[PDB]
Amino acid sequence: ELYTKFARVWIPDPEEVWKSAELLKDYKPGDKVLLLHLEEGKDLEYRLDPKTGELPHLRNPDILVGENDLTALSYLHEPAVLHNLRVRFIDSKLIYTYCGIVLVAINPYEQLPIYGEDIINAYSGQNMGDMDPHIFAVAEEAYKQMARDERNQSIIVSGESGAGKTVSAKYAMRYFATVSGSASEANVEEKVLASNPIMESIGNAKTTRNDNASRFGKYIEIGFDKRYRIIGANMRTYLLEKSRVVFQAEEERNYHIFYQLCASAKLPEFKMLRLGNADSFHYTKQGGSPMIEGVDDAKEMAHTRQACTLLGISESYQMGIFRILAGILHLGNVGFASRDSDSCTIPPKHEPLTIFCDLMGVDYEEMCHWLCHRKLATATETYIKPISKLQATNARDALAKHIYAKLFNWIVDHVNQALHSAVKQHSFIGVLDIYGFETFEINSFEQFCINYANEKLQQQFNMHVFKLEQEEYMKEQIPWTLIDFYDNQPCINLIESKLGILDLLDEECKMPKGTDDTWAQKLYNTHLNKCALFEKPRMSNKAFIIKHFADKVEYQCEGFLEKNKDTVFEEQIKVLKSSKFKMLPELFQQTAKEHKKTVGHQFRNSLHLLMETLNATTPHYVRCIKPNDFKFPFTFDEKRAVQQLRACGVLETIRISAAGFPSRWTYQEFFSRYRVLMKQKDVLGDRKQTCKNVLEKLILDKDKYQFGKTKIFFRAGQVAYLEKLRADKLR
Amino acid sequence: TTALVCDNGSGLVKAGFAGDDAPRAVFPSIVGRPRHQGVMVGMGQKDSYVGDEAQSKRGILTLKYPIEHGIITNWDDMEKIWHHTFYNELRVAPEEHPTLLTEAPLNPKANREKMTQIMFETFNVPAMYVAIQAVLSLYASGRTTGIVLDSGDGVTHNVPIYEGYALPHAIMRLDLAGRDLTDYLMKILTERGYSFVTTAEREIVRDIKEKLCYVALDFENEMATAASSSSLEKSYELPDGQVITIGNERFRCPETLFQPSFIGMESAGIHETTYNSIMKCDIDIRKDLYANNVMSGGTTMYPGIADRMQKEITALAPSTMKIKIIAPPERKYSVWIGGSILASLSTFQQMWITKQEYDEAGPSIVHRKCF
Amino acid sequence: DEDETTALVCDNGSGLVKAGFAGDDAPRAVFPSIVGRPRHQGVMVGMGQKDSYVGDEAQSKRGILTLKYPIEHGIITNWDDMEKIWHHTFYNELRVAPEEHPTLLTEAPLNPKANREKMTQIMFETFNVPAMYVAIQAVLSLYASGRTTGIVLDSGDGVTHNVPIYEGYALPHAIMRLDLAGRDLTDYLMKILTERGYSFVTTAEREIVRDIKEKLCYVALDFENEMATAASSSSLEKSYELPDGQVITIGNERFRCPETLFQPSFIGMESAGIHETTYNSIMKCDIDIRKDLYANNVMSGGTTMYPGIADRMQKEITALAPSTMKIKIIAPPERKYSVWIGGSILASLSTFQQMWITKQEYDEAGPSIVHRKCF
Amino acid sequence: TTALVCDNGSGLVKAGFAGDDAPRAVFPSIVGRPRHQGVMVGMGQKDSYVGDEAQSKRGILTLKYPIEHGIITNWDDMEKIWHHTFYNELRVAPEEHPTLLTEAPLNPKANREKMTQIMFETFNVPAMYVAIQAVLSLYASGRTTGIVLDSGDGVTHNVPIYEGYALPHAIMRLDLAGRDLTDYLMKILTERGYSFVTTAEREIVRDIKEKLCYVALDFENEMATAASSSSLEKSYELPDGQVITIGNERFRCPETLFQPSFIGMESAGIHETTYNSIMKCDIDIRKDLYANNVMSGGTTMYPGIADRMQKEITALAPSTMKIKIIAPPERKYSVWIGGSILASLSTFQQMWITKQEYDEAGPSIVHRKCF
Ligand SMILES: Nc1ncnc2c1ncn2[C@@H]1O[C@H](COP(=O)(O)OP(=O)(O)O)[C@@H](O)[C@H]1O
Ligand SMILES: Nc1ncnc2c1ncn2[C@@H]1O[C@H](COP(=O)(O)OP(=O)(O)O)[C@@H](O)[C@H]1O
Ligand SMILES: Nc1ncnc2c1ncn2[C@@H]1O[C@H](COP(=O)(O)OP(=O)(O)O)[C@@H](O)[C@H]1O
Ligand SMILES: Nc1ncnc2c1ncn2[C@@H]1O[C@H](COP(=O)(O)OP(=O)(O)O)[C@@H](O)[C@H]1O
Ligand SMILES: [Mg+2]
Ligand SMILES: [Mg+2]
Ligand SMILES: [Mg+2]
Ligand SMILES: [Mg+2]
């Protein structure tokens, strides 16, 4: 039995998560209690599950717990893999690690000088597998593959907010520059550093988990030529939250830019825009926390104006962006009085609307009319209909979401104008700065869309892991059928397919008597007993459950329908496109289909386009882990760390690896280590044939190992069992 | 843990936790099933509805009664009713709290056994118990001695009790109850051309009954004032706006409790069964039963019934005996309140039939526990 | 998945056909359901007049061609001409092959079973549609109204019909179809214009009387008072300039014509007026739901597009119903496309994509399949 | 004196003297009124027409029925029908002979009161009486014990009787009758394009119904042979000489009596109301009621209905019960016949509300005389 008296195990804790314990006896089969030795003393006994006979996780030998890849461990379970990263981060202060293809990075909240030119010059020209794990190792892998294969590459950075995704992308970008010298005629690195403060101001918001989080997929292309020398860059944007512009969750707030405007309303230039307060403005008052503790949004507005000035966008255009943003909030204050026969109206000289019409340079009478009524065209005649108060707020808020998304894209076009070059690229490396899985005790449309986006990236990752293993098996002349493929497309098809979760939400969005409760009733009728994946709480009819890769997630049905709406009447676009202001004609420079899609259908469009962009490039992968929530240097918390490992999905790739053949060793390394076990009569004139013969005597079952042309593959725990036999022979 | 308490009422279920002053859930024990054709292609649809969500769809639904004559007629409907109470109404796991249920005297042994079986087989209750409605409404009345007349929707019953001990040979169950008064009310409204035929229309006649009807202190006098003065008439507004005039029938429908001949029964009136069940008791204790006639159940909610029942018991009993008829205001929930009190007492854990007792001894353990 | 083999949706109107794709807000094609045929000889051999003309190209040749009507009283009279109307819609108007997209069609309640079967047969055998469906106009105009409960009064060119609905369920005994419709109002209008010597006899002249009807006529709020002001004030005579150039006066007829809907005795019918049929069909429903039908009287179809009709209907129903019921009439603009819009909504639902009679299902089950699919 | 007897039929009146083997007068209870004007000077028309002289003027007159749902709707038209029977048909003064009239069970008190009032205050009758249709058709059948189902044009009632005594708790009234079958027949003929809309056309559909329709023994079997073999198709010449073809509708129409859901009723079928009426009777008499199911009234004159009824009751009753149905050859003339039997009975001469008796107790003398 591997349950001996020197073999430590792992016992759960509601605090330390996992405590190591040492066996005081050799466990015998059918024993119902096991005697253990904790770090606090031999004061513990262990009752074995009397229904399944389950024993605690065995600890790995001391010769295996010191490595830079989790794949080097024999036993592959949460206690062992959490501990391996923990000791590295605490004792050796190691931030990087490998999980097969994946690089992992634990944020040390402490200036590390492993980014000096002297480390860059030591790693340069050498093999990434001979070097220690580092951003430079995956960056120089991608550079080498781009030059050798003549094919574009992409590094996918993901994790929680504050985890180092931005920070790791800057180090990767610095390396891409230094590996080809410099671009002093373009200064792409300075322009990228000037873009990020203005991009996060318009694209990030405050959340209950973090004072600042990104709400979209940021994608930067780094271009190179035939000399593979960096010549320029481009900024791409995807999966942007639309609901945020209008709706705020409790203890959260809108995009930081909106409050930068609000805090700066004291200055004479912003005073002309007649900006008031965040409690008066609707798209901002809802959250209950307009200001962030320890942060001054007026100092951030000074920084973003300097960053715009470094990018070279005119101060006249900056003030134009501010004037538009002041306008869309005055528009949010336009409230409609209810009328008879499903109608509404606006008060005479309504002050938010008179200010809006003056700021946007449009006629009040036309703006008032196209909101008190709506147009309906036919093949014979045009007609005008009354519009309900609820239809008018939905149209106003869909219009506000649309015109902000156009303004965002306008700003991103100027960022591209600064980053691009007249010199054509021969090749390019992408960096994707996307997020991890999202879960809470109550989940909304936003969390659903975030998890749907993670499932697609996970499918690509799952396929790649299989593809590379299959290529390694074929190279070692080992049957592919011996590895199993674990994917997640059923969870994807459940959401986007016909009559799936998303298509029933679009159907309930178009139906005139559809409701959040009627959608929930449709989901219970269509997927409850037709998909074991789908689940439903018994003591409620307001929520539904979906199996996602990381864990199952429960979503509250209420709000989904309202948030999916994005329809806006084209006459309301026309009266703003005819603005006397110079910017609005350039914001709305086919539209008839686009102005009728739902948010969910726009999100699906965006995600599939990003998925095919990442499918064209050769992919690489890195995970960012935040070790605590107190922002303390080198402070590790097991509760936060195991949650991060789950969000990053790495506990499932470690499991796929363990279910297959994780540990693997060349016949010569195997011989060098276990020659002690071999007798003079056992050793042959060939070490390969020696190792094949003695391994079949040491381990009688033939499914425990796999013989290659150059290396032996092993199941989980089998190398630890050999090390146990090696130790038991010595003593 | 806090035990759950529920009255299995034949037309109205009450439910809550032990210690609650009043039942936190109350609804009609009605399943409603569609009777029309869905012509809206691609809409949200349900199979059958329960209580208030059946009553809001009357007409389009035809209505059912899982209990009749105080006994269960369909266990598949009762399973849905119980599911509703636990997860959809009280939102509580039945595996967490014990379940006290109720029943009328002279209820079949098979009805109690199958009710016991379902609680442990499908709802997986840790422990349960079935209590006679009478003893519970006497606990709510707060005396150790007294005869209860409990009259519900589907059954009416007399139970004399002394020093906490019932007299099982003296009890008298009667099938005349509030449903038969509703069925008679349709016939006597049809005499003025106000006919009704659907179960959805029967619910409107039932409202009319509960709103307008009352017991006469002297029928012959009330018939004479209805014929001569005619001032007893009331107009009622039906759901489509039309008014109907209801008078004379306002005292004739409940008078059936004292005169069962109206509906062709050979059975004696409610006062005569209270008198006869006291006469079955020992002569030394009758005086204490006459001093403690407890009214109970929703059919005892007729204006004037306590004064009549008195004139009627005083006419049968000796003139030396002090006839007293007590009627607890909240008669509709007297049984539930008594269950909520009983389930709270530290001296009730022995009565809880545990799952382990059911699994070992079989469903007939419920009878051994009770007797 | 912006591309869906987007279904085609069409209302087979007895005097006016509408068609388009699902998801179009309005019918992109609309024309008179008229086949015109020449009644004169060719003055030359190179004349070569088309054997038949359809819709607008028949209307531009009035008096030279005789106009027919492939539909009468809501039912098809000539299937060869309905094949010609359908062919026109597919390639000579929408410019689309019927083998690509499924087709939704429509009909009035109490339509004969053979009319539905032969319509389904021609679509699968002549046009070779992959899948098709046939929908009652009342549920479609209720989708366009946007409520799960109400009574619709649909009044077209060739048929009128009442249908009460609640919780998405209908009452098959309470429905009431009436043959009085916009064509009979046009025929009566010719008779009452003939009182001023304005005689009309051709179907080409009927079309001018039909324009006059749609342009000048209105429903009165009190007929006896409107007769008194017509006789005394005499300020109701509107001289309609005929297309040719004949200024012809129209006065009392501007209300006597549409009043036939409330007074069918003008045209010798024993049948009740439109308000009486809406009241009786509510009074056949169960007593609880009547209050919800009174709150939701939906007007639909082109014959309801008369000035004053909703206010008269509100008074006429209020005079019949109990005074405690709040009588509400629902009569928005453009009610002539309500049925089509409802078809375009239905064909766009994901839950409707399993309710398509397929070409294989027809080939296996035979023409009776359309009845199994409905009931 | 020789007493007069008349059945107030909702679509067909029968009349004659007590002692007549059959009603010497019979005609449709229809008043027809012109819906057109006068095309010539002179040629004076009647303001209203009665029975056969209305039927000969169809399309020129609109037909009205003074009785609906078994109750009178217009008393001025009932006074017109009554005048016709006395002088314009029987040629006899109502002042010379007493009059027996007939009504259904569960008929409004006001209908009976106004009927007796008009006969004394206008026809000045010396004495009169009003008798339930069921007891009369049971006297005609010839059994002191038997449940009689009288299905006419506007009413259908299952009335059980034993040793003469009726059971008012088990009687059952049903509004489904021969008129609703005629209205349904118009709908199912409209499915083949044979539409009908006037009351004059409804009379042709009614002839078609009475001539060609029949009750299926097993609906599914007759539906399968109608679909596969189609031999049930038959022709019919309309007045104008046009032939129409009717098949399947011939059994679908009268099947509504066993399946009232065709016309949207929640109500049970005629066999279920017969069974439920026996199940409400005392257990000792059920065997005698099963042995004596009497068919009565003109809607029972459909072929196959007695064989279907026997099968349907045999499927509901215990297999030991001898289900014996009796369908008197003249089910149509059975109420009138029993009325003339009770008219020639010399003992009944004590049960006649006299003219003086009427004056004594206003219009409710008939109520006391009956009950
Ligand atoms: N490798 C690192 N060394 C030191 N500090 C780091 C490192 N990675 C991240 N940080 C810290 O994390 C914060 C920035 O992380 P960032 O990548 O901007 O987070 P996110 O992109 O998740 O919002 C700063 O406090 C920074 O000092
Ligand atoms: N105020 C009232 N007047 C008359 N009858 C009433 C009144 N309130 C309730 N009822 C009748 O009492 C019965 C319901 O009372 P309840 O004790 O809850 O019966 P159960 O428990 O058997 O369902 C019904 O028959 C109802 O019509
Ligand atoms: N504005 C109007 N005023 C009066 N009658 C109208 C008006 N518009 C259309 N009609 C009449 O209504 C009928 C058109 O109704 P429609 O719904 O198009 O019928 P269908 O679909 O059966 O062809 C025609 O008789 C037409 O003359
Ligand atoms: N032979 C028959 N077959 C079918 N229906 C018939 C037949 N004879 C009469 N009826 C129908 O039965 C009804 C006549 O029943 P009857 O007893 O005369 O009623 P009432 O006395 O109320 O007028 C009418 O609806 C008539 O059409
Ligand atoms: Mg940040
Ligand atoms: Mg009770
Ligand atoms: Mg139409
Ligand atoms: Mg009869």
Author numbering:
A (entry chain A): 5 to 593, 626 to 767
B (entry chain D), D (entry chain C): 5 to 375
C (entry chain B): 2 to 376
Lines from the paper:
Myosins are molecular motors that move or move along filamentous actin (F-actin). Myosins comprise a motor domain, which can be divided into four subdomains (N-terminal, upper 50-kDa (U50), lower 50-kDa (L50) and converter), a light chain-binding domain and a tail region. Primed myosin, with ADP and Pi bound, rebinds F-actin, leading to Pi release, cleft closure and generation of movement, proposedly through swinging of the lever (power stroke), towards the barbed end of F-actin (+actin)13 for most myosins. Here, to address these issues, we performed time-resolved cryogenic electron microscopy (cryo-EM)4 of a myosin-5 mutant having slow hydrolysis product release.
Our postPS actomyosin-5 structure shows a closed actin-binding cleft as well as a postPS lever position and has high similarity to previous structures of strongly bound actomyosin complexes (ADP-bound or rigor states). The cryo-EM density shows clear evidence for the presence of MgADP and we, therefore, identify the postPS state as ADP-bound actomyosin-5. We observe that the position of the lever is more similar to that observed in previous rigor structures, rather than ADP-bound structures. We also observe that the density for the magnesium ion in the nucleotide-binding pocket is in a different position to that seen in other ADP-bound structures. These additional interactions increase the surface area of the binding interface from 375 Å2 in the primed state to 729 Å2 in the postPS state, creating a much stronger binding interface and providing the structural basis for the transition from weak to strong binding. In the postPS actomyosin structure, the interactions of loop 2 with actin subdomain 1 are different to those seen in the primed structure. Pseudo-atomic modelling suggests that interactions of H631 with acetyl-D1 and K629 with D24 are broken and the C-terminal portion of loop 2 adopts a helical conformation with K629 and K633 forming stronger ionic interactions with actin E2. Within the nucleotide-binding pocket, there are relative movements between switch 2, switch 1 and the P-loop that indicate that Pi has been released in the postPS structure.
